[PDB]
């Protein structure tokens, strides 16, 4: 089963439902939102316009019930987010955690996993 999106930063994100646990290990959306708040400065800085959608793809993956796997954003989306947001993170130096290392996300039209792009 699925649950409506309750994380404030993932409202009006493109899809309506999610399933716990997410891809970050959290087992409810409350605890998911609290650890998502660590990246709130980067969403606000807008170094990439799709960073909020990419992050929500992992902290609140899409759920429809038919599809049996949580669905993240494409590899294509994450690389651009870490590329274009790296300069400002370099300044503060806290680097993209391996929790978010882009090479875990499936490429678009990848043999074993499905992905999403942003509206």
């Amino acid at each position, epitope marked *: 089963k699925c649950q409506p999106i309750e994380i404030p930063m993932c409202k009006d994100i493109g899809y309506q439902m999610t399933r716990m646990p997410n891809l970050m290990g959290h087992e409810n959306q409350r605890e998911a939102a609290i650890q998502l708040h660590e990246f709130a400065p980067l969403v*606000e800085y*807008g170094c990439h316009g799709h960073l909020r959608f990419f992050l929500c793809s992992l902290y609140a993956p899409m759920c429809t019930e038919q599809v049996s796997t949580p669905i993240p954003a494409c590899r294509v989306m994450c690389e651009q987010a870490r590329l274009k947001c790296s300069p400002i993170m370099e300044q*503060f130096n806290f680097k993209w955690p391996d929790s978010l290392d882009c090479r875990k996300l499936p490429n678009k039209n990848d043999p074993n996993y499905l992905c999403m792009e942003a509206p």
Partner: antibody
Amino acid sequence: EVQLVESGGGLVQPGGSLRLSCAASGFPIRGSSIHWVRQAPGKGLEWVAATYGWPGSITYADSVKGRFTISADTSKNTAYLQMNSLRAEDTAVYYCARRHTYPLWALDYWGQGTLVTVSS
Amino acid sequence: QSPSSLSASVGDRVTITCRASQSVSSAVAWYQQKPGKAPKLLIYSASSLYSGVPSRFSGSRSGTDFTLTISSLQPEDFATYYCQQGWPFFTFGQGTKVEIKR
């Protein structure tokens, strides 16, 4: 609904210390972004210090870095601004304010301020 | 520093400029402050009108410049206006105090 009330203002001599209180009602202090913004009389607003919610990411302005320190105590649901080695330049009305995150990213609620006077 | 002054009449169109750098995000807020009161939020994210703010208020970013425009200045609008930067500067610009021509 959201409301912030400042306390702890008053008079202090140069080099002295003061601690302001920012009492929150309507939202939890823990996991919330609070900013301190001061206004010297007849002058403009000056952002001073801020938390982004978690213990880290506490930021200060250069004019106060080293001398001012942010705290909180979730039981009382109030944040604190410890001010040390005060100079007369720090004479100002001190505001605390909640920074609404997504989708605002703005100080949507302010206290009424408390006056801090540093003088001999 | 001290706020800049601008003299205007009711019904005038005013555009206040907040000069920054292009290395700053568009999470810029605009505030309105009247004597002896706390600032009030007008515009967030450079262009989004806050709730209960009249439609004659407007925000836009162009390069390094953020602007506030009042399309038809009304008597309640004469006050001081401040822009604020987003993370990680959070710095306020110089205020613009709009006073009424008489």
